[PDB]
Amino acid sequence: DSFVIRGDEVRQIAPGQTGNIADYNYKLPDDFTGCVIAWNSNNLDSKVG
Amino acid sequence: SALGKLQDVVNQNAQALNTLVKQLSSNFGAISSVLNDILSRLDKVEAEV
């Protein structure tokens, strides 16, 4: 599963979590078997204004 | 005092059951012994521990 996120919400990307992503955008099961992988993209995904 | 044996047998059972009930209030290194309290305070994962 693939998307772009703000750094503050990266900790919501875990089992048992709550907060706007886990609430309303992307949700794991509590017995998730897997890896969570992310990299900053403030060059690729970001612009003045 | 002649009937001591029979009263002793009831007393042992009432004692055992009362202590068995009393242990519900004990905390066992946990945050609380009220079950629904734990569920109200915590992260799902912490509450599971």
Curated annotation (Swiss-Prot), chain A:
* Outcome when changing K47T: In strain: Omicron/BQ.1.1
* Annotated segments matching region Integrin-binding motif: 6-8
Please describe, based on the UniProt annotation, the reported consequence of changing D8N: In strain: Omicron/BA.2, Omicron/BA.2.12.1, Omicron/BA.2.75, Omicron/BA.4, Omicron/BA.5, Omicron/BQ.1.1, Omicron/XBB.1.5, Omicron/EG.5.1; complete loss of interaction with host integrins
Its annotated function is as follows: Attaches the virion to the cell membrane by interacting with host receptor, initiating the infection. The major receptor is host ACE2. When S2/S2' has been cleaved, binding to the receptor triggers direct fusion at the cell membrane. When S2/S2' has not been cleaved, binding to the receptor results in internalization of the virus by endocytosis using host TFRC and GRM2 and leading to fusion of the virion membrane with the host endosomal membrane. Alternatively, may use NRP1/NRP2 and integrin as entry receptors.
Q: How does it assemble?
A: Binds to host ACE2. RBD also interacts with the N-linked glycan on 'Asn-90' of ACE2. Cleavage of S generates a polybasic C-terminal sequence on S1 that binds to host Neuropilin-1 (NRP1) and Neuropilin-2 (NRP2) receptors. Interacts with host integrin alpha-5/beta-1 (ITGA5:ITGB1) and with ACE2 in complex with integrin alpha-5/beta-1 (ITGA5:ITGB1). May interact via cytoplasmic c-terminus with M protein. May interact (via N-terminus) with host bilirubin and biliverdin, thereby preventing antibody binding to the SARS-CoV-2 spike NTD via an allosteric mechanism.
State the protein's name.
Spike protein S1
* Organism of provenance: Severe acute respiratory syndrome coronavirus 2 (2019-nCoV)
Kindly list the organism's lineage.
Viruses, Riboviria, Orthornavirae, Pisuviricota, Pisoniviricetes
Instruction: Name the encoding gene, please.
Output: S
Full-sequence range covered = 398 to 446 of 1273
Swiss-Prot record, chain B:
In the UniProt annotation, what is the result of changing N27K?
Answer: In strain: Omicron/BA.1, Omicron/BA.2, Omicron/BA.2.12.1, Omicron/BA.2.75, Omicron/BA.4, Omicron/BA.5, Omicron/BQ.1.1, Omicron/XBB.1.5, Omicron/EG.5.1
Domain of life (superkingdom):
Viruses
Residue ranges the record marks as coiled coil: 7-49
Q: What does this protein do?
A: Subunit of the fusion protein that is processed upon entry into the host cell. Mediates fusion of the virion and cellular membranes by functioning as a class I viral fusion protein. Contains a viral fusion peptide that is unmasked after S2 cleavage. This cleavage can occur at the cell membrane by host TMPRSS2 or during endocytosis by host CSTL. In either case, this triggers an extensive and irreversible conformational change that leads to fusion of the viral envelope with the cellular cytoplasmic membrane, releasing viral genomic RNA into the host cell cytoplasm.
* The protein's name: Spike protein S2'
Q: Which source organism?
A: Severe acute respiratory syndrome coronavirus 2
Q: Which gene encodes it?
A: S
**Entire protein: which part is shown?**
943 to 991 of 1273
